[PDB]
Amino acid sequence: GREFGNLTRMRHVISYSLSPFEQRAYPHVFTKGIPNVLRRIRESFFRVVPQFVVFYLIYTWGTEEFERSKRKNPAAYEN
C-alpha cells in the first residue's frame, strides 16, 4: 500500500533504539569516525581520481600546445 501500515511482510526482526537525548551526537569521533571516513575515501579514491587525473593531463597538454602553436617559428622568415 501507500501508508506505513501495509508496505511489506517481515517477521521476527527486532530493533533496539535509544533516545536522541540519552546518547551522544558525536560518538566515536576519533576511535571510529575518522578511520571510517578514511576507509571510505580509500575505497572510492582509485575509482574516481584516475579519470580526473587524465582530464588534468589533457588540460595541461592542451594549454601548453595552444601556447606553443601561438608562438611564431623563425623558419617562416629564414630567407
Partner: protein, 378 residues
C-alpha cells in the same frame, strides 16, 4: 484522528511531506532535488524584486540594470543573488541528473521524462534571462542561439524571424524574452509538481538499488533537518559566491552596452551551456551541429532503454563506475573547451570529447553492463 489527516489540504501535506515513507539510507545526493525547488523559489522571489525596476526595452535595459545596482536599495544584492542563484540552480541540476544516472533513478521512466522536460524549460528560461541584461554577450549570444533555428530545412528563416520579431535581435526580441522569462518558471514549478506526483507512486530510491520497504521512514523528523542542513550549505555557497566573488561566474564583456555592429572577440555562452557550445562547434555541418546538440540534451530519454544490467544502482558495478567518472571528466573537458577559443588543439580535443561522450552514453555503457552481467554468472 489528528487534524493533519482530516483537512484535505492537511491530508495532502501530511501524506506527501510529513509522513512520506522515505528510505533511511538515502545519502546527501537526494538533498539536491529539494535544493532545486528552493533555488526555484529563490529565482521566483529575487527575480520578482528585479522585475519591479527592470525595463524590457533595448534602449533602457542596460540603464535599468545600472539603476537597479546603483540606486535601488540593496538592489546589487538582489541582482547578484539572482545571477549566482541561476548558476547554483544549474550546479544542483547537473548534480541531480548525475545522481539519477549513477543510482539508476532513470528506471522511473515517467519521472525521468518529466525531469527531461524540466531541464529543457530551465535551459530556455536561463537563456532568455541572460539575454535580458542586453549586454554585449547577452545580445550576441541571443543572436547566435536564435540563428541556430535557421538550420531547419524548410521553415528555417521564417521561424527565426518570427521569434526575433523582426529582421534581427532588437527591442521586440528583448520584450518577448522578458515575458517568456517571467512566465516560464511557474510552468517549471507546475512541471516539478508533476515530477513529484509521478515520483510519489513508487517512492524514492536508495543508493543500494534495492527495495527499501523494510526500512521506510517518515520524512518529517529526519529528512526535514537533513534538507534544512542542505539548505544551509546551499545558502553558504550562494552567499559566499555573491559576497566575495560576485563576478567569478560572469563575463566582463557583458558589462558593455550591446553593440549590434561589433561581435566581441570571445563571444561564449554562459558556463552551463559550454558543453552544448563545444558539441555545436565540433560538428562541421550547421544542421549536423544543431542535431548533435539536440541529441546531446535528449540522450537522457534513450538512457533508460540502454540499461542492460541486472542491478539498478552502480555502487556494485565498478566498471560502470569507471565509465561514469570518465563521462563526468569528459563533460568537464567539454566545458573547459567551451571556455577556450577555436584553435588547433581545442578543436580536435573538442571533437574527440564529443565523440567519446556519445559513444560512452551509447556503446561503452551497455557493453560494460553486459560484461558485468556475465561477470556475476547471471
Amino acid at each position: 484522528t489528528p487534524m493533519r489527516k482530516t483537512n484535505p489540504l492537511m491530508k495532502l501535506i501530511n501524506h506527501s511531506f510529513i509522513d512520506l515513507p522515505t528510505p533511511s539510507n538515502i545519502s546527501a545526493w537526494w538533498n539536491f532535488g529539494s535544493l532545486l525547488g528552493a533555488c526555484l523559489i529563490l529565482q521566483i522571489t529575487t527575480g520578482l524584486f528585479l522585475a519591479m525596476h527592470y525595463s524590457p526595452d533595448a534602449s533602457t535595459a542596460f540603464s535599468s540594470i545600472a539603476h537597479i545596482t546603483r540606486d535601488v536599495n540593496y538592489g546589487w544584492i538582489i541582482r547578484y543573488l539572482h545571477a549566482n542563484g541561476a548558476s547554483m540552480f544549474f550546479i544542483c541540476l547537473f548534480l541531480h541528473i548525475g545522481r539519477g544516472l549513477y543510482y539508476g533513478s532513470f528506471l522511473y521512466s515517467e519521472t525521468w521524462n518529466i525531469g527531461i522536460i524540466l531541464l529543457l524549460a530551465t535551459m530556455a528560461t536561463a537563456f532568455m534571462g541572460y539575454v535580458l541584461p542586453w549586454g554585449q554577450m547577452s545580445f550576441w549570444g541571443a543572436t547566435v542561439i536564435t540563428n541556430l533555428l535557421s538550420a531547419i530545412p524548410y521553415i528555417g528563416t521564417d521561424l527565426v524571424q518570427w521569434i526575433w520579431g523582426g529582421y534581427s535581435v532588437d527591442s521586440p526580441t528583448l520584450t518577448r524574452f522578458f515575458t517568456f522569462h517571467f512566465i516560464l518558471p511557474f510552468i517549471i514549478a507546475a512541471l516539478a509538481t508533476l515530477h513529484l506526483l509521478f515520483l510519489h507512486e513508487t517512492g524514492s530510491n536508495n543508493p543500494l538499488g534495492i527495495t527499501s520497504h523494510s526500512d521506510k521512514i517518515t520524512f518529517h523528523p529526519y529528512y526535514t533537518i537533513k534538507d534544512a542542513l542542505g539548505l544551509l550549505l546551499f545558502l553558504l555557497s550562494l552567499m559566499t559566491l555573491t559576497l566575495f566573488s560576485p563576478d567569478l561566474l560572469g563575463d566582463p564583456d557583458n558589462y558593455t552596452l550591446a553593440n549590434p555592429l561589433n561581435t566581441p572577440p570571445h563571444i561564449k555562452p554562459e558556463w552551463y551551456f559550454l558543453f552544448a557550445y563545444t558539441i555545436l562547434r565540433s560538428v562541421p555541418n550547421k544542421l549536423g551541429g544543431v542535431l548533435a546538440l539536440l541529441l546531446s540534451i535528449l540522450i537522457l530519454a534513450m538512457i533508460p532503454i540502454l540499461h542492460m544490467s541486472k542491478q539498478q544502482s552502480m555502487m556494485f558495478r565498478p566498471l560502470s563506475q569507471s565509465l561514469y567518472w570518465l563521462l563526468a571528466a569528459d563533460l568537464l573537458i567539454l566545458t573547459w573547451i567551451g571556455g577556450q577559443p577555436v584553435s588547433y588543439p581545442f578543436t580536435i580535443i573538442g571533437q574527440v570529447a564529443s565523440v567519446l561522450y556519445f559513444t560512452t552514453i551509447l556503446i561503452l555503457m551497455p557493453t560494460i553492463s553486459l560484461i558485468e552481467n556475465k561477470m556475476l554468472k547471471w
